């Protein structure tokens, strides 16, 4: 019966993982999402927005590209009772319906804590950022950056973005071991795309044993969790966090009182705890998707979109 439609930055490997826990909810609550992605661009991804407004869908999610972006589309939405949602990345606007959003901040310190850890408080880093004006990199590195305060004996050689994207991350890291080379201590990842390409990268050096530590555990990041070429990430389940922004969406088109703004907080991942990820996210992912509305609907009761069952969690 309902039209939503979703606008996603790009098919990342974070969205493609999550994309089939948002199919999943919407199949069992008689939705028909309507997928775009904007391939990284946000005049794409405007114009994506446009055209579900006049499709006269029923709500909208974005996952933004900018996050100072799409004030136009966001207003006219309201103007037009259409419900729009921010969902995993932020907005600027102050006209959203909801906002479902991970706690950046506190996974960027999560991870640069994991490395400071690692390294005992010294060393050379480099760090690898997400898309240039997504809250995204804004918000984690925030977060590597109050603790960062905390280290005088960390330094960090270089930071750039590689876009979240693997192959941009080996080309960046490729240039950081041609100028410091075994200056390098670690790799401070915002994803675990980007760290997975610092890995290739170092590799092909010669070099192993180089911490790396990353945020999402998608599937790859939780296998390098487990073999040890990561030390560490922070779950960002794809299929809990956007189904989660849709049950607030769906909420929304009912006319139903719901949270609009719950927060995922991502719990540590290590080899203490990999496991169970692993079931979730990489060989036990139908089960988990059987268990999906239902854990969304109680975890939409209690706030915590994060819950999962994760060693460590509430
Ligand atoms: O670019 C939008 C989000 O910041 C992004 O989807 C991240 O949450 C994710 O960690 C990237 O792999
Ligand atoms: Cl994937
Ligand atoms: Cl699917
Ligand atoms: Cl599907
Ligand atoms: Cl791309
Ligand atoms: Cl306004
Ligand atoms: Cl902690
Ligand atoms: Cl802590
Ligand atoms: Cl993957
Ligand atoms: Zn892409
Ligand atoms: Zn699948
Ligand atoms: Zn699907
Ligand atoms: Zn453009
Ligand atoms: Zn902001
Ligand atoms: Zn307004
Ligand atoms: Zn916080
Ligand atoms: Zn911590
Ligand atoms: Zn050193
Ligand atoms: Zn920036
Ligand atoms: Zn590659
Ligand atoms: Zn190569
Ligand atoms: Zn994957
Ligand atoms: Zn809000
Ligand atoms: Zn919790």
């Given at each position: 019966?309902?039209?939503?439609?979703?606008?996603?930055?790009?098919?990342?490997?974070?969205?493609?993982?999550?994309?089939?826990?948002?199919?999943?909810?919407?199949?069992?609550?008689?939705?028909?999402?309507?997928?775009?992605?904007?391939?990284?661009?946000?005049?794409?991804?405007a114009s994506q927005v446009?055209?579900?407004?006049?499709?006269?869908?029923?709500?909208?999610?974005?996952?933004?590209?900018?996050?100072?972006?799409?004030?136009?589309?966001?207003?006219?939405?309201?103007?037009?009772?259409?419900?729009?949602?921010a969902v995993n990345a932020?907005?600027?606007?102050?006209?959203?319906?909801?906002?479902?959003?991970?706690?950046?901040?506190?996974?960027?310190?999560?991870?640069?804590?994991?490395?400071?850890?690692?390294?005992?408080?010294?060393?050379?880093?480099?760090?690898?950022?997400?898309?240039?004006?997504?809250?995204?990199?804004?918000?984690?590195?925030?977060?590597?950056?109050?603790?960062?305060?905390?280290?005088?004996?960390?330094?960090?050689?270089?930071?750039?973005?590689?876009?979240?994207?693997?192959?941009?991350?080996?080309?960046?890291?490729?240039?950081?071991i041609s100028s410091f080379?075994?200056?390098?201590?670690?790799?401070?990842?915002?994803?675990?795309?980007?760290?997975?390409?610092?890995?290739?990268?170092?590799?092909?050096?010669?070099?192993?044993?180089?911490?790396?530590?990353?945020?999402?555990?998608?599937?790859?990041?939780?296998?390098?969790?487990?073999?040890?070429?990561?030390?560490?990430?922070?779950?960002?389940?794809?299929?809990?966090?956007?189904?989660?922004?849709?049950?607030?969406?769906?909420?929304?088109?009912?006319?139903?009182?719901?949270?609009?703004?719950?927060?995922?907080?991502?719990?540590?991942?290590?080899?203490?705890?990999?496991?169970?990820?692993?079931?979730?996210?990489?060989?036990?992912?139908?089960?988990?998707?059987?268990?999906?509305?239902?854990?969304?609907?109680?975890?939409?009761?209690?706030?915590?979109?994060?819950?999962?069952?994760?060693?460590?969690?509430?």
């Amino acid at each position: 019966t309902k039209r939503i439609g979703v606008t996603v930055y790009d098919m990342s490997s974070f969205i493609t993982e999550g994309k089939e826990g948002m199919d999943t909810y919407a199949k069992a609550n008689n939705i028909e999402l309507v997928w775009n992605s904007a391939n990284n661009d946000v005049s794409t991804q405007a114009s994506q927005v446009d055209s579900l407004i006049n499709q006269g869908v029923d709500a909208i999610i974005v996952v933004p590209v900018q996050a100072d972006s799409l004030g136009p589309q966001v207003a006219s939405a309201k103007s037009k009772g259409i419900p729009l949602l921010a969902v995993n990345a932020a907005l600027e606007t102050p006209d959203l319906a909801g906002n479902v959003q991970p706690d950046d901040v506190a996974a960027g310190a999560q991870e640069m804590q994991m490395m400071a850890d690692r390294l005992g408080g010294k060393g050379n880093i480099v760090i690898l950022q997400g898309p240039l004006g997504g809250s995204g990199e804004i918000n984690r590195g925030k977060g590597i950056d109050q603790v960062l305060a905390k280290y005088p004996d960390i330094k960090v050689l270089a930071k750039d973005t590689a876009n979240w994207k693997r192959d941009e991350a080996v080309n960046k890291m490729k240039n950081w071991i041609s100028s410091f080379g075994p200056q390098i201590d670690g790799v401070v990842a915002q994803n675990d795309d980007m760290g997975l390409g610092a890995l290739q990268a170092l590799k092909e050096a010669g070099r192993t044993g180089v911490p790396i530590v990353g945020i999402d555990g998608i599937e790859d990041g939780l296998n390098a969790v487990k073999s040890g070429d990561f030390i560490g990430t922070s779950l960002q389940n794809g299929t809990v966090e956007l189904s989660a922004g849709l049950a607030v969406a769906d909420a929304l088109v009912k006319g139903e009182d719901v949270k609009t703004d719950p927060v995922y907080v991502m719990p540590a991942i290590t080899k203490d705890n990999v496991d169970v990820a692993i079931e979730h996210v990489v060989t036990e992912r139908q089960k988990f998707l059987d268990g999906l509305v239902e854990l969304t609907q109680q975890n939409l009761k209690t706030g915590d979109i994060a819950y999962e069952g994760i060693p460590g969690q509430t």
